[PDB]
């Protein structure tokens, strides 16, 4: 991840289903030279703490946990991890029933 790599997904995040933001935590390990980038987006306003979601990013691994959703965040959400010259993602769906 610092000489000739791109952007790929090693351990994408899984999906989940709850009533709202109970405890659906996620973690996707993505590499990228020199450092990869994560972006959770699908339709609920690029996920990333847009109003009721809580995402975070580390060195080469991001993590998304929903615990503040309101009542209209459906279930499909994704994460396009891109780097200095790559562009992959991880599609999953965190649904809610409230």
Swiss-Prot record:
Subcellular location: Cytoplasm; Nucleus
Tissue and organ distribution: Isoforms 3, 7 and 8 are expressed in cardiac muscle. Isoform 4 is expressed in vertebrate skeletal muscle. Isoform 6 is expressed in skeletal muscle (at protein level).
Function description: Key component in the assembly and functioning of vertebrate striated muscles. By providing connections at the level of individual microfilaments, it contributes to the fine balance of forces between the two halves of the sarcomere. The size and extensibility of the cross-links are the main determinants of sarcomere extensibility properties of muscle. In non-muscle cells, seems to play a role in chromosome condensation and chromosome segregation during mitosis. Might link the lamina network to chromatin or nuclear actin, or both during interphase.
Comment on protein domains: ZIS1 and ZIS5 regions contain multiple SPXR consensus sites for ERK- and CDK-like protein kinases as well as multiple SP motifs. ZIS1 could adopt a closed conformation which would block the TCAP-binding site. The PEVK region may serve as an entropic spring of a chain of structural folds and may also be an interaction site to other myofilament proteins to form interfilament connectivity in the sarcomere.
Subunit structure: Interacts with MYOM1, MYOM2, tropomyosin and myosin. Interacts with actin, primarily via the PEVK domains and with MYPN. Interacts with FHL2, NEB, CRYAB, LMNA/lamin-A and LMNB/lamin-B. Interacts with TCAP/telethonin and/or ANK1 isoform Mu17/ank1.5, via the first two N-terminal immunoglobulin domains. Interacts with TRIM63 and TRIM55, through several domains including immunoglobulin domains 141 and 142. Interacts with ANKRD1, ANKRD2 and ANKRD23, via the region between immunoglobulin domains 77 and 78 and interacts with CAPN3, via immunoglobulin domain 79.
Family under the similarity heading: Belongs to the protein kinase superfamily. CAMK Ser/Thr protein kinase family.
Protein name: Titin
Native organism: Homo sapiens
